[PDB]
């Protein structure tokens, strides 16, 4: 038996993951994202530079026997992209993509994976929300190309709005912890009561009770809040991004400005992509620090396997007894034909014996009247 | 079944009123019944009677859409994968350490016996004390009397049960009350059914 | 910044690895090998079942917090294929391929990688050397498809010859001496059947006459020396491959059940390809693996087409004009052109080759 | 107490060990099933009885808060039993550990097992080479399959009546189960003089 959150991916699932991993990688590359392939392991000094407590706890530690120094098995590739951008990126716009195995000490969600195949894209060096719209464009090209029946819905949030309501209203760590717990738990009554006590409290209850309706939200906020340009611009970014997703990609967009997870990592707009009614987001993206401006997304490619189908494979057996009756020149000719079928992606087995049977056989390649041809089983 | 499944476990006795005023009065009286699933006056709501210990499990996996769980259970189980919508302010008790009456601290690392293992490890961690924890399933009052543990972590209302068993309350860990928890999918997909019942409860506790 | 034997693969090298890993995988799949993707981690119970001391020492251990049990980060995928074949394989011929990251505690050889990208193929359930000839043919089609200037030289060994000399007549002593080609020390230490043991070392290379040099008694060995000759000739006749023989190549003494292949690129110390017979009912098995990352140095792709849309021109476009340029750009990406929709006038892709420019209601590619 | 402490569970075990104890010279003073006391004297003033939840008997014994106990093999297998001696099979409380799902419903995908017997479940389905998600339950498990929390449950069954009465059917046999006499490893070395007669009488009785 394997450890919880660890599974084999076998046979057609493995072929399908191979095809996904590859198609999505070339898509990102054709959109001008540079593929980087950082290693599974690094010294913790680099791997967890500016890490959260969640990321440190999620990273398996191992000892470098060469030096005695602590190393980690990466639980997230994103920090490695930072290290790479810092070294090679320059001061102008830079684009990176990646696909790589990451390992988590504990599962994300109930019976969730600890070995997600992490695929992602990041844009460094652009302030404009234009870069966030570009990531959305690349993401949605990728998703549409998978010809899934599953629908992706996108939650937009903006940590800036709450971070500002918290600053302008001089909230205590204590208080901020309270509201975040209450938001995270959709506790409207508990929040309504607590806000009657807190300064600019009406604003904090408004984000919860009226955040979904982004088009009117600024109008519902206090004079103080509506005055602050960070809040005005933040509510603007959500509007620009929301419309773009509906108009350009016919994407169902919900808005939740009380979506404050990754509070420490997120510096602005946040996009979460949900497949069907599945609890854990398939895609986690948004603005983060590098004074280097940066935005990005990532997904576990392995979570797409359930919602993607390939055309049935053609699995082909050359007739053992017929092939052995052939003269040399007849064999060169049948090999030239088999080479052609493999070019076309047919899975062809030169049999070692009369009993050699490929798994899920569909066709034999058989001799009849000086002609080799495929015959369904 | 296209409607809401409610996970209940004292709590059945104290939620009846909240449910009555929400429009969900149970047909049978569970205490004397063999049925696992229970219909109600509202044909869009059914009730599962579980052991309190299991309510957060059924909800979190979506075998129930919402449940009434003690904060004692939620803290021990971990409420990471459910929404805590409201504090019902019923079954008001507290989580406490308890040892033998007038018995002194031993000259060795403290041994806690309890069903509330994660609560124990967590509490004594915040007190910066190193404890050996022993998992129990049944009644814990015996554990100190036969020296399985020096202390127990249990829920206490008045104190009568501890005293009746020769034990005395030591340290207050935290306050406890029944909390209304909701499955994350159910909250998004069945909110139309939930909102009236939630608004009625919010009303009822005021 | 990174630990010894740990490197980034960046930019065109990363794209090239992605292309290699993929081309070689689909080649193996088109030859009827089933792709399996086992996980990076298992409990040590399964991951190191029947492991050598080399394998155990090379595997990082980590703690499963859910259960308190020991897990390992795999240093080799091959054992996972065994576990997979045992479960799903049945008793007939079965073929598997795989590509996956593996992690080593210490480097393989001098300046070796600790993060090899391991690609391999294995055949289970065939006694016939025919299955070894199939692996050789698949491996060499894969290598020829890379259009490298680099030459592969193949060392053949056969552990059975020594395993028999050992049975028909210390073991750790000779293997140390052999492993180091320490001839004088070996000659001395030869004084049961000692002459035979020194002969394997001193006359192993000349396989055609080796049987004749062995003690009458010693003359499994007959067939073993036959297998080497069949495989040697096949590689020379069919692939025009320089083949050397070393019957004292007992590196994998614990895993290897018969014929062993090592494939060297140019004059590089560590083999690029490690193959041969291993056990997996008495289920027969043979296979190979290579570090795909070690091919990067000896492979070249066509230069990429890297394309910038003109910022100024794109912004002047009405909605319908933008829909049309997007349809065109979508087509260029379908063709594998790398196209950037610029966020600013200064947005410049690395290694630009072409701009897409507007002139008289028409967008066209122009070399820089 | 300078003498032996015996860990029993109320109901079935207590009911079926009473005769074995009577013929060993340990007849209880009071009748527990109607009593509030935790520790119970007996005809022998060198033997006392602790009445625990079956789930806890192996804990009290293993830590030496009881010198010996009567535990179901179901409990021992689930709990571990690494740290106690299993001296004899009493051949009382004869039931079996089994998988159970809905009647005539077939196995679907990766199985989800809901049970008290998590370690038994992980162990069994491992030897079947079947990959399972396991869900811990504390209370009665018959509801779990009916609301789709799990596809199967692992439970003890004697006849089958409880499963059928709940719409469930016994699926796979895991192993046979009976009450086993377990001893604390220190107690067996230090109090053998007291133990030998009681052990010899039980061996005789069965
Ligand atoms: N004395 C008490 N006063 C108030 N609330 C209590 C008290 N004891 C327990 N509770 C609350 O009720 C919950 C337990 O319910 P109850 O005591 O009716 O069942 P239980 O003893 O847990 O039963 P079971 O053995 O089936 O688990 C606790 O989680 C707590 O929130
Ligand atoms: N139907 C049965 N027939 C025989 N032995 C049984 C049966 N069911 C359970 N047992 C055995 O007896 C033990 C059950 O003890 P008991 O009847 O006290 O159950 P419990 O879960 O401890 O609590 P409860 O008092 O609620 O039943 C198990 O460990 C098992 O070995
Ligand atoms: O009288 P107090 O000290 O304030 O506390 C009353 C006790 O009763 C509760 O269990 P419950 O009433 O459910 O008992 P039961 O488990 O035997 O039903 C709980 O275990 C408390 O310890
Ligand atoms: O083979 P069967 O006749 O179906 O019996 C099996 C039942 O026996 C046990 O209950 P127990 O007799 O201990 O009753 P309780 O747990 O409900 O008190 C156990 O919890 C099973 O549900």
Numbering used by the authors:
A (entry chain B): 1 to 290, 301 to 387
B (entry chain D): 21 to 29, 32 to 228
C (entry chain A): 1 to 169, 175 to 196, 199 to 226, 230 to 290, 300 to 387
D (entry chain C): 21 to 128, 130 to 227
From the manuscript:
ATP phosphoribosyltransferase catalyses the first step of histidine biosynthesis and is controlled via a complex allosteric mechanism where the regulatory protein HisZ enhances catalysis by the catalytic protein HisGS while mediating allosteric inhibition by histidine. First, crystal structures of the Michaelis complexes of the activated, hetero-octameric holoenzyme (henceforth referred to as PaATPPRT) and of the nonactivated, dimeric enzyme (henceforth referred to as PaHisGS) showed Arg56 of one of the catalytic subunits reaching across the dimer interface to form a salt-bridge with the pyrophosphate moiety of PRPP in the active site of the other subunit in the PaATPPRT structure but not in the PaHisGS structure. Therefore, allosteric activation was proposed to lead to more efficient leaving group departure at the transition state by stabilisation of the negative charge build-up on the pyrophosphate upon nucleophilic attack of ATP N1 on PRPP C129.
Intriguingly, upon PaHisZ binding to R56A-PaHisGS, part of the activity was recovered. In an attempt to gain insight into the effect of the R56A mutation at the atomic level, we solved the crystal structures of both R56A-PaHisGS and R56A-PaATPPRT bound to PRPP:ATP. The active site interactions are very similar between the two structures, except the electron density for Mg2+ in R56A-PaATPPRT was not well defined, so the metal was not modelled in, and the hydrogen bond between E163 and the PRPP 3ʹ-OH is absent in R56A-PaHisGS. The structures are also very similar to those of the respective WT enzymes.
